[PDB]
Structure formats: C-alpha cells, structure tokens
Design an enzyme around this catalytic site. Structure first.
Site, PDB file in Angstrom:
ATOM      1  N   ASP A 144       1.242  -1.340  -0.290  1.00 41.49           N
ATOM      2  CA  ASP A 144       0.388   0.109  -0.415  1.00 41.49           C
ATOM      3  C   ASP A 144       1.096   1.231  -0.323  1.00 41.49           C
ATOM      4  OD1 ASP A 144      -1.625   1.701   0.584  1.00 41.49           O
ATOM      5  OD2 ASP A 144      -2.304   1.485   2.497  1.00 41.49           O
ATOM      6  N   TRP A 170       5.408  -4.295   8.145  1.00 44.61           N
ATOM      7  CA  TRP A 170       4.886  -5.289   7.880  1.00 44.61           C
ATOM      8  C   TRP A 170       5.902  -5.980   6.689  1.00 44.61           C
ATOM      9  CZ3 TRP A 170       3.694   0.383   5.497  1.00 44.61           C
ATOM     10  CH2 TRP A 170       3.288  -0.123   4.085  1.00 44.61           C
ATOM     11  N   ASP A 185       9.607   0.761   4.584  1.00 42.91           N
ATOM     12  CA  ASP A 185       9.627   2.746   3.489  1.00 42.91           C
ATOM     13  C   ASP A 185      10.546   2.872   3.586  1.00 42.91           C
ATOM     14  OD1 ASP A 185       6.462   2.098   3.834  1.00 42.91           O
ATOM     15  OD2 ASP A 185       6.220   3.422   5.387  1.00 42.91           O
ATOM     16  N   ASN A 209      -1.502  -2.925   6.361  1.00 45.03           N
ATOM     17  CA  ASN A 209      -0.432  -1.907   5.339  1.00 45.03           C
ATOM     18  C   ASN A 209      -1.753  -0.511   5.959  1.00 45.03           C
ATOM     19  OD1 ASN A 209      -3.016  -2.454   3.359  1.00 45.03           O
ATOM     20  ND2 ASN A 209      -1.381  -3.826   2.322  1.00 45.03           N
ATOM     21  N   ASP A 210      -2.374   0.084   5.825  1.00 48.17           N
ATOM     22  CA  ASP A 210      -3.199   1.070   6.485  1.00 48.17           C
ATOM     23  C   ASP A 210      -2.141   1.842   7.642  1.00 48.17           C
ATOM     24  OD1 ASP A 210      -4.881   0.443   4.681  1.00 48.17           O
ATOM     25  OD2 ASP A 210      -6.286  -0.280   6.746  1.00 48.17           O
ATOM     26  N   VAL A 211      -1.347   2.012   7.759  1.00 51.11           N
ATOM     27  CA  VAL A 211      -0.577   2.377   8.565  1.00 51.11           C
ATOM     28  C   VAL A 211       1.055   2.964   8.161  1.00 51.11           C
ATOM     29  CG1 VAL A 211      -1.360   1.725  10.596  1.00 51.11           C
ATOM     30  CG2 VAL A 211       0.656   0.708  10.012  1.00 51.11           C
TER      31      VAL A 211
HETATM   32  N1  LIG Z   1       3.328   0.818   3.400  1.00 50.61           N
HETATM   33  C1  LIG Z   1       3.434   2.193   4.019  1.00 50.61           C
HETATM   34  O1  LIG Z   1       3.331   2.592   5.021  1.00 50.61           O
HETATM   35  C2  LIG Z   1       2.545   3.301   2.819  1.00 50.61           C
HETATM   36  C3  LIG Z   1       0.902   4.145   3.834  1.00 50.61           C
HETATM   37  C4  LIG Z   1       0.130   3.531   3.654  1.00 50.61           C
HETATM   38  N2  LIG Z   1      -1.079   3.964   4.274  1.00 50.61           N
HETATM   39  C5  LIG Z   1      -0.595   5.111   4.811  1.00 50.61           C
HETATM   40  C6  LIG Z   1      -1.117   6.672   5.617  1.00 50.61           C
HETATM   41  C7  LIG Z   1      -0.654   7.287   5.993  1.00 50.61           C
HETATM   42  C8  LIG Z   1       0.901   7.546   5.671  1.00 50.61           C
HETATM   43  C9  LIG Z   1       1.598   6.143   5.206  1.00 50.61           C
HETATM   44  C10 LIG Z   1       0.881   5.607   4.558  1.00 50.61           C
END
Ligand SMILES: *NC(=O)Cc1c[nH]c2ccccc12
Ligand SMILES: *NC(=O)Cc1c[nH]c2ccccc12
Lengths: 122, 360, 110, 361
Positions: free
Chosen positions: C14, C39, C58, C86-88
């Site tokens: 994501d 993750w 990341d 993966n939503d963080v």
């Molecule tokens: N894989 C990630 O860290 C990217 C990602 C996916 N969702 C978000 C929300 C806020 C910031 C970075 C994000």
C-alpha cells in the site's frame, strides 16, 4: 445595478473566470471557496496589499478599478482556478503583476484564494 | 535482501534535468523532480516546501533551493531560506537564513540565479518593495541587500564576468551590479532606456548570450543589451514578424518563453496567433527559430502547447514544458527535431533546467 | 514488470513502488531513509510455486513520490495483527516520518 | 466601493454540515478537512491538517478537533504530534495540545481518533510501533498518560451508555474495556472472552455501534457482537450475512469505514462485493446491503456506487457514502435507502466523512 453587485447575481456567473471583474485573476476564486467576492472564507485573512488594474463591465459599458486582494493563512482552496491576464504586466510594473503571491506580507503567507474587489470607476 | 540507503543518483550528471513542480493545488508540497532526459527515467526528487525555487550550482556539485517554512505551516514564525543539497546524493547539507521577504511567485529563472563564478547566489526579494539579495555560498550567509534595485525585477547574470548581473528597471532600462569578492556591491551602472514600459513591455526572460542578451516584447519586438563593455549598450526594437505574420496577429507568449543557441545565434520563441491584450501567457502554437544576426525567422515548428523552455549549449538541446510534460529537442540544426516526450514529469511546472556540464 | 502492481512480490504493498521513484526494490531513492520496521506479506512466487516472506520497509524523510501507487492486500490483516497491517505508515518510528515510497524486500521462504 | 473582510462564520447552519477528511495522499503533508453542506453540495470552508491529519467534531458541536504531525522543516527537524482545537463556526485555530511523538499515522478509520461519550476526553491510538491508547483532557488542554493495558490491541470504540468508557479490539480476538476516572487515568478495566478467531475469521475494525452493543463484520461475511449493557462485555457470533445464493457467488464485505447502524431500527449497513477471495477486503462496494440485526435477515440491497466508507446520522436518518472523491447522500428512514444526490469532487483522497452533530444527548 446587478452587474456591480455579485451577491445579487447568479452564483454560476460570479464563479466563472469569464465574469467581467475577474479580468486579471491568477488563483482560486474565493467565492468558490466558502467566501464571497468580498469576504474571505472562514479562518482566512485578507491581504493588505494586492495587484490592481481596470476591467470593462460589458453590462453598463464602463470601466472599473479592481483590487485583486488575496485571502491568506490557509492552504490552497483548489476550486475555480483562473489565470486571466488582461492588462497584466511583469514585475517591473509590480502592482500590475499577478505571478507573485499577494499574501507575501501577511502574518502567514500561505495562499488560500484570490478575488476581485471593486474600488470604483477607472 | 536488505534495504539500504545512502545511494547516489543512478544516471550521470550530464543526463539529468530538473523539473520544478510548484504543485500549485498543494503549494506547501512543491518539489524538484530529477529526470534522465535520454530515456525519461525518474531519478529522484528534492522537497521544497511552500513555492520552492531551484537552481543547480554552476560547477554541478550542489543543488540550491529557496523556500519558506513556518513553525506550524499556516501559523507560527516564518523562516525564508536557501538550502544547499548534494547533487548526487540528493541530501540536505545546510540552511542559509534569509530575511523574510524572498520572492513568492512563479518559477521564472531570473528570480533565483547565481554569479558566473558560482560563488554567490543572487535572488529576488519583494516585501513588496523590491531588492536583490546576495548569498555567499562558501560562508553560508546572506551578505548584501541591493536596495539600488528598488523598482526593478529579476536577475540576468553576465556570462562574461565573474560576479556581475543585470536587472530590468521601471524606467525601461537595465541596472548592472558588479559584486566584489566579498559579495558586496563593488560598482553599478544604469543603461539608457531600452524599451517603453507602457507602449512595448518586454517579457523578463532573456535569450542570453555570452556578452549580450535579447528580450522579446508583448507585441513581438526584440530588444538587446550588449555587455561586452562595462557600460551596457541597448537597442531595439526589431520585429519578429513579417507582413503575413502581422495579418494573423502572431505574438509571443509563455513564461520562460525564449532561449538562445550561442554557437549559431539562433533565438527560440514561443508564439501564438490571434494575439491581443491578455494573451501574453498563452501556450505556444509554434516555436519560431530566429537568426539574431540577420533579424529574420529561419524555421517554425509546432509548439505542443509549451509555456517554458531551456537550452543546453554543448549537446545542442532544447527542452520545452507545457506544465506537465517535457519535450526534448535536438537543435544542432536550424529546424529542431523532437526526440521524445516525458509525460507526467510534473503536476504544475513552469520551469525545467539541465544539470550544468560547462564548469566554472 | 517490477514497476507493476501485479509483480508477485508486491502482494501487500500500500504505497508508491520505490523502483518507480529513483530507487530499486531493495534500495531507497537517493536521500530517503529506510524504515527499521515494516509490515510483512506472504506472497506466492508464480515461477517456483513457493510462498515467500516479503518485508515492506518504507523509505522516509522525503515527500510522497507519487509514482506507481499500489494497494494490494493479499493476506493483509487489521491493526490488531499489527505487523501484517498496511494501512499505517511504516515510517512512523523514523527520525523523519514523512512517507516517500515502499520497498519489497525478500526475506526468504515462508 | 467594496472592502474585503475576514472574521466570518460558516454560511450554512451546523445541521447542514459534513466533514470530508481529505488525506491528499499524493501530497500527504497538505491533508485537510473539507466542510460541505450536504443539502446542496456547497463547499463551505476547510481546516488545514498538515501530515496525515485526523479529525472529529466535539460531541457538543462547538469545536473541531484535529490530530496531526509537524516537523520544524517538514522532512527534517524536531517532530511535534498534536491535537488542535478549532472553532467550528469560524474555522479558526484556538489551541494546540502536545502529544508524545507516536500518534497513529495511517488511514482515517473512525476508531483511531474518538472521544468519551461525555466529551471530556479525546481518546486516540498510538503506535511507536508498540500500541497504546492516548488520553487527552480537553478541559485542561493536557495529555494525561498512555493506556499501556491496550498493548497489542487496536482502535477505540466508545461505549455510548457510559460517560468515560471505551473498548479496543485485541490480538487475542477479544475486547478490552477501559473505564477512566475523572482525571482521565484508568480507573478499571476488563477483558472479554474471545469473540472471533483472529486466524480463521478476522473482523473489520469498524463497529456498527449501538447504545449498548456493537456489531462487527468479518472478512468472510460473518457478524459478531459485543453487548456492554451489563457489568462486563458479553460476546457472541458468528451469524452469516449470506444466504445460499450469496455464498455461491462469494459475496463478502469490503471497504474501510464499511458498516453503520441505524440505532432506532436495528438496521446494519454494509458494503459488499461478489467474487470474494484472499485480498479483496478493501474492494469498493458493488452493493450496500441492509440487514435487520434482530431477525438476522437482509432487508434491502442497492447499488454500491464504488463506495469505500460510510457514516450514519441517527437524528436525521441519513447515510453518507464515499468512494474516495465523491459523497453520496441517502435517506435511510425506510428499509430501502433512497439516493438524494452526489457531491462530486469533495476530496482527492478521502476515506472518512462525518456529520456535524445535532443533539445526541
Ligand atoms: N506502506 C506505507 O507505509 C504507506 C502508507 C499506507 N497508508 C498510509 C497512511 C499514512 C501514511 C503512509 C501510509
Ligand atoms: N494572485 C495570487 O496571489 C495567487 C498566486 C499566483 N501566483 C502565485 C505564486 C505563488 C503563490 C501564490 C500565487
């Protein structure tokens, strides 16, 4: 005199880049951003300085002095972007120039939206 | 596998171009995008906060940015800065404090420049009163504020002197500033009037030669400033237009809208038909190629709706930019040849620049 | 193929693929910093038919790359199974948490 | 003739307002809240929220709370995580409340940034990446302390039948309940029995929240519930959303803020799509299903309009849905929802919309 009084006009007309008084607007129209032609959106601050110029009113056939003040201190509105250039001149004619941020002297210079304030007859 | 950082840009400096993305819809997140012009590959980027400006050091080693921060973005104390970044690692190295009046505006080249010798950054201020600021790169300090330039606008370096530049003044003439080795004003001079501000305003973007600069006007005239001597000699107008051109109201339009190929004297200009008051920033219908010695057009090609351009002298290249896409042209012959288009190079860019290869 | 969201190792990405951002699958773009944490996804290799553990570190400290956005969710679970989620922002513990892009690092066989 | 003035209030009354949290993921350092009039689609104003903002409205309707992260030089320099209090009618900044530098950075699930029923405490998710719940005392403008008991848990479900209690979903498949004292510190806590199998039937975190119970949907279309009417939470489930025909076509839930409960009727709203399989749990809605939670039967199904998130207003019997950019407005006063209008271009990248509160005591 509807042509001089945007609050009495059709919002679709006033929110258009073709509206007669928006003739040197580079930016987002404040009337599309939660404000009106002469009022900043809530929580944004008028600029004390601006570019200026004249625009022809085809409705009454007269020419008017416009002051293109910005509203400042909020991030970009994003709505109703215009880039009209009638009688606009470069920065060696600085107060006729619209490629600079007229929020530049505000307490917070972040550009939110711009408008066209009617000063009077040219 | 292990994820690592600390890497350098993957393509040689000579392949690199810099697309300054204002991101006007989200102008607090402007950035520079680095591309390889030979294949369109995205190489990296430099973040530039609110309405950044960018240039590459003349020696090719560093990237300079100019931007504004606030403690809480939309509130809190303002900090206007120049930043020095490593060109190969695309990392931040140092911040140079500016007074809180650096120009906030669209990315004309002449708002953020450097001396030919690369020792001083020369930038436009507006409070809204105008002045030119001088930054000593080595010292990392703002060292001079040229109030002589009040009522003038933009910085045109002189490529034939180490620390000299010109600005366009409200009288229609040019002010020349010669800096000393300390970055303070060592001398200055004022030209005679070059153009009528009211009757034939010029675009600020120069078509810059080693010892002279050409400027085009809202009505399609050309003016020149010759700085082969200490005193600038001005002339013009000559017209870009022949009688057929006039009949269709061709005029220039754009932002960084001209360029000069120094070896040939060819000047490149974005042009559009049906010119009238208010069309000076219209996209190019055509690029015209002018012989500045004979004062006549030699070629015309489709403009691809371009607004800004830049030239690489030594590889005989021109880039054009329509706000989002970069076109790469070979200008080794009088008719430019389109090599490729890099799509989606930016969301809202009016400035592209090559990495310097000519040294200091 | 590695710049496509359908590449087999990207099955729980994501974010923006770092390989489209001036890096590679296992190297951050210049001037962006790896996350020490991530993750993890379990992705099926279409060549050898085996499942592999992929660590989605990341790269951080630069603003959003904006290229090659993916949102794949194979075996992804909510935040009560946090290291599968993966939503963080997995840049959350970096010196600078601004999210730049996502890498797809092969750890080994499941 | 004219003079440009500031200091103005939002032009439409509170009861017309909704808040679209625009992450602006492509430029996530310039996230913002867009304020709209849901009755006519008019843009009313905005609140800037820096990097990955979160937002909620105070229960009393007077203030907007945001949560965000700053750094001194955005991509470098010292981090400041904060809650900000903004005036709702003037859309002006009033106060910053400092947080420890571990507020959750992530997509805008409701349960990451909530408040106690009595409105006295803001209750937010932390991740460092170790998880804890943060408590903010709104009156004092202070961070109280981490609820460390919530380690290994995720998200905040307030209990609407108590002034300062909430639950969180734990990695054991149960719920942890936290009861705060008047100072915002933990006064007591309890843990339910296992509600769901984390391995075999994971639930979406978004609750369908009633006054004294909450329902959750699973990746495979089951429904679980937590009843907090009594001293301790009683858990149950599964029951299936699906009939044989539904199962045959592999219908399953998908989305983000993907469920809602209309409390007076017991109708639960859920985004659904066919051809479910591993990896489809965030797919846009093919349909919205409306379930009677008492009879455990579907009472309506309507086109989903590719929606991902929703919210329900109990006071006006409305549902909003959101596809990332556009907001759909539905009347849900009858079992079949009726589409009233779509507000186009309300955001670039939003997964959360919320009504301005009316009433709700
Ligand atoms: N894989 C990630 O860290 C990217 C990602 C996916 N969702 C978000 C929300 C806020 C910031 C970075 C994000
Ligand atoms: N008229 C305005 O002040 C809006 C505007 C137009 N050009 C720019 C550049 C930078 C910031 C704001 C700008």
């Amino acid at each position: 005199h509807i042509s001089l009084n945007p609050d009495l006009a059709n919002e679709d007309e006033v929110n258009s880049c073709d509206y007669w008084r928006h003739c040197a607007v580079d930016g987002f129209l404040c009337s599309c951003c939660g404000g009106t032609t002469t009022t900043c959106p809530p929580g944004s601050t008028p600029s004390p300085i601006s570019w200026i110029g004249t625009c022809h009113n085809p409705h009454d056939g007269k020419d008017y002095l416009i002051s293109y003040h910005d509203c400042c201190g909020k991030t970009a509105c994003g709505r109703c972007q215009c880039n009209t250039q009638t009688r606009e001149r470069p920065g060696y004619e600085f107060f006729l120039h619209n490629d600079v941020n007229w929020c530049m002297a505000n307490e917070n210079s972040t550009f939110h939206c711009t408008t066209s304030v009617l000063v009077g007859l040219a | 596998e292990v994820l690592t950082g600390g890497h350098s840009v993957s393509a040689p400096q000579e392949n690199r171009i810099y697309v300054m993305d204002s991101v006007f819809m989200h102008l607090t997140e402007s950035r520079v995008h680095v591309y390889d012009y030979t294949n369109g590959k995205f190489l990296g980027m430099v973040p530039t906060a609110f309405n950044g400006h960018v240039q590459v050091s003349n020696d090719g080693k560093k990237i300079y940015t100019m931007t504004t921060y606030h403690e809480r973005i939309t509130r809190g104390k303002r900090s206007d800065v120049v930043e020095v970044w490593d060109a190969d690692k695309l990392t931040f190295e140092k911040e140079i404090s500016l007074p809180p009046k650096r120009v906030q505006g669209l990315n004309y080249d002449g708002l953020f420049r450097q001396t030919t010798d690369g020792k001083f950054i020369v930038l436009q201020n507006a409070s809204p009163a105008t002045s030119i600021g001088i930054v000593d790169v080595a010292k990392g300090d703002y060292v001079e504020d040229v109030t002589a330039a009040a009522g003038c606008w933009s910085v045109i370096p002189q490529p034939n002197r180490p620390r000299s530049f010109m600005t366009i003044c409200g009288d229609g003439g040019l002010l020349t500033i010669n800096l000393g080795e300390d970055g303070k004003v060592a001398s200055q001079s004022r030209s005679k009037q070059m153009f009528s501000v009211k009757d034939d305003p010029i675009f600020i973007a120069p078509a810059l030669d080693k010892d002279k600069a050409h400027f085009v006007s809202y009505y399609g005239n050309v003016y020149s400033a010759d700085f082969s001597g200490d005193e600038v000699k001005v002339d013009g107008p000559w017209s870009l237009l022949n009688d057929e051109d006039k009949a269709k109201n061709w005029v220039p339009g754009g932002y960084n809208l001209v360029g000069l190929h120094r070896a040939s004297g060819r000047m490149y200009v974005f042009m559009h038909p049906d010119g009238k008051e208010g069309t000076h920033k219209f996209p190019a219908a055509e690029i015209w190629v002018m012989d500045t010695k004979t004062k006549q057009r030699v070629a015309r090609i489709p403009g691809r709706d371009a607004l800004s351009m830049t030239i690489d002298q030594q590889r005989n290249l021109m880039l054009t930019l329509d706000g989002g896409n970069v076109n790469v042209y070979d200008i080794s012959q009088p008719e430019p040849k389109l090599l490729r288009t890099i799509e989606g190079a930016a969301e809202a860019s009016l400035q592209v620049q090559f990495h310097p290869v000519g040294g200091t």
